[PDB]
Copies of this chain bind each other. A is one copy, B any other.
């Protein structure tokens, strides 16, 4: 969806204000984030790998980082808000985090199925051959 560089900048700016509290060089002997990650990012498991890493920093690394180093707290928190904010725009970009989005068609189907109760179950079951034809059409167009 464009120029980031554009979006990325804030996020690099927020990391420059917190860099000095963590190393200021960086690990530098045996890396944690090795090129293996970059190959998955480049593969067919790309979105999942990115979504999973984003989630790893926001929920496991930053709060823990805020705890080891209370003087960095406000800097780390802002870094995590810019990262929360990037993920939201990446979701809006069909091409960047499709994998974090959910099917509105399935949500409606699930919502009718709940309203219909008993009849809901008989319809989902009677139409199972339509589901099978849609699977065949999906595998054929992919």
Mask, A39-61, CB within 8 Å of B = 1, is: 11110111111101100110011
Contact A53–B106 (Cβ < 8 Å): yes
Residue-wise, chain A 114-128 has the 8 Å CB interface mask toward B (1 for contact) of 001010111111111
How many chain A residues touch B (Cβ–Cβ < 8 Å)?
84
Q: Beta-carbon contacts of A52-75 to B below 8 Å, as 1s and 0s?
A: 110011001100110010000000
Closest to A124 in B: B61
A8 touches B103 (CB 8 A): no
Q: A-side interface residues toward B, CB under 8 Å?
A: 4-5, 8, 11-12, 15, 18-19, 22-28, 31-34, 36-42, 44-50, 52-53, 56-57, 60-61, 64-65, 68, 76, 79, 86, 94-96, 98-99, 101-106, 108-110, 112-113, 116, 118, 120-132, 134-139, 141-142
Interface of A, secondary structure class, is helix
